[PDB]
Amino acid sequence: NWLGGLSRAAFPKRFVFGTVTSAYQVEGMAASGGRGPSIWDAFAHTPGNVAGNQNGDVATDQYHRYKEDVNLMKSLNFDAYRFSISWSRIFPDGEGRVNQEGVAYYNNLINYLLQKGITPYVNLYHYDLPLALEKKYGGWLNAKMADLFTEYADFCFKTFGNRVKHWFTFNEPRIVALLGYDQGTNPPKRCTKCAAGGNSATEPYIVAHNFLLSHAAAVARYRTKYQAAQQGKVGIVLDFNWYEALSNSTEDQAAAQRARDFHIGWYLDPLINGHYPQIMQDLVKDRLPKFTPEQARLVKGSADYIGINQYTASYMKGQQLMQQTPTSYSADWQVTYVFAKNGKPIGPQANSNWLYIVPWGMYGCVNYIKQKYGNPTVVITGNGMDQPANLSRDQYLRDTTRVHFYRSYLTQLKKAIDEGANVAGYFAWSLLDNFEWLSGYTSKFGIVYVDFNTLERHPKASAYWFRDMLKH
Ligand SMILES: OC[C@H]1O[C@H](F)[C@H](O)[C@@H](O)[C@@H]1O
Ligand SMILES: [Zn+2]
């Protein structure tokens, strides 16, 4: 049967199912309703930066149509909705003056979700730093971001926290550090060679450190000022794609483990254990900032749950560890990516070149976190796959590959959970086709089709699959 034995009965009692979006990717009204620009508005408006010179000015226009989209997620039997608040829609300059119209939007969205029986899971940050803070402070290179982010978080806790009980601070700080400061392909476009300046060997580590310190400061503020009255929780969202040793050799197994540590351990070891992974300390040395004992104690235990975005898996091949002139965070790992074993690809690719369809990667990742980090509460905060541009409407709706994707990946998640992993929830990226960063509207991740000419929504087969699987 097309559900492949899956239903709410196949998951733990009270397991949470939802869908996910982010502000810049779906809201639209980017320069309206009092919203100030983010670094992504500046980046997307520069010719050549995004596919087709597209931008999030209108996106899916969820700003005007949010009740339609909430009605739709309820009709599909979801329990929860993960979305983000745009910092520059609340504080156009990132600090100081509050945009009351922006505040009213999120109030209206939250209230409607609750009216419809959908639990809000709210991200404070999803790549969309206020442009004013980039220009004035240098963004995530500046330790002052801890204070700036904390004041923003404080306002959100105060304003929405009587209703919102499930918060996340950041979304994938690894990707910010990697793409923004190592490779220089996302804003602020920094890297050793880049026109904007930068240093691919040092800046990604500075940035990650400041994300961890800011997360910790925001959570300390929540716990000391708001938690007694509000009784909610705050976590963080981290990306984790799986790494599998190419062979059982000592060096291939070491390589796969090094990749895990540089990928997820970079954040989880501080959040769980209060230090950076030993291998990163050993290889990155004085380029890796040191937490003071007080800072490490603030960071350790500061996530009430760990959000994991899980998409794909790679084979890793090793080498003898070498003394090397530092060049980049990426080269620091001393690993070799490989996409076939025994003459077979690890999986077929979705539309995005990086996205290999490997359902057992989901089991790999969840099992690994369970075994290595004392089985913390995990929420799968995003998982999904994309269709290419230029299909007909009907071709978009017949998304049989995405149906197979979710059935297979959710079967592997169920496998990890049945073996004892503490997973509390699962969220599909995305509710809607949306603005896919550098790919613009050329990549379609939604279980709901969005016609970007007319803005109409049409559920795809994968939406109906969820509705059938999730019926109460
Ligand atoms: O690449 C698909 C999707 O991956 C992650 F979930 C990011 O948080 C999203 O912003 C992105 O659109
Ligand atoms: Zn509109």
From Swiss-Prot:
Main location per the UniProt record: secreted
Q: How does it assemble?
A: Homodimer.
Q: Which residues form the active site?
A: 172, 382
Positions with a binding annotation for a beta-D-glucoside: 25, 126, 171-172, 311, 382, 429, 436-437, 445
Disulfide pairs?
191-194
- Keywords for this protein: Disulfide bond, Glycoprotein, Glycosidase, Hydrolase, Secreted, Signal
* PANTHER family to which the protein is assigned, alphabetical: BETA-GLUCOSIDASE 7, GLYCOSYL HYDROLASE
Q: Name one GO cellular component term.
A: extracellular region
Protein name, please? Beta-glucosidase 7
Q: Give the catalytic activity.
A: Hydrolysis of terminal, non-reducing beta-D-glucosyl residues with release of beta-D-glucose
Described function: Hydrolyzes p-nitrophenyl beta-D-glucoside, p-nitrophenyl beta-D-mannoside, p-nitrophenyl beta-D-galactoside, p-nitrophenyl beta-D-xyloside, p-nitrophenyl beta-D-fucoside, p-nitrophenyl beta-L-arabinoside, oligosaccharides, pyridoxine beta-D-glucoside and the cyanogenic glucosides amygdalin, prunasin and dhurrin. Possesses pyridoxine transglucosylation activity.
In the record, the effect of residue 186 to H is given as: Decreases KM for substrate about 2-fold
Q: Where in the cell is it found?
A: Secreted
Q: Which superkingdom, per the lineage? A: Eukaryota
Question: Which Enzyme Commission number(s) are listed?
Answer: 3.2.1.21
User: Its Gene Ontology molecular function terms?
Assistant: amygdalin beta-glucosidase activity; beta-D-fucosidase activity; beta-galactosidase activity; beta-gentiobiose beta-glucosidase activity; beta-glucosidase activity; beta-L-arabinosidase activity; beta-mannosidase activity; cellobiose glucosidase activity
Q: Name one GO biological process term.
A: carbohydrate metabolic process
> Which residues carry a glycan?
248, 390
Under Gene3D superfamilies, the record lists: Glycosidases (3.20.20.80)
Give the protein family. Answer: Belongs to the glycosyl hydrolase 1 family.
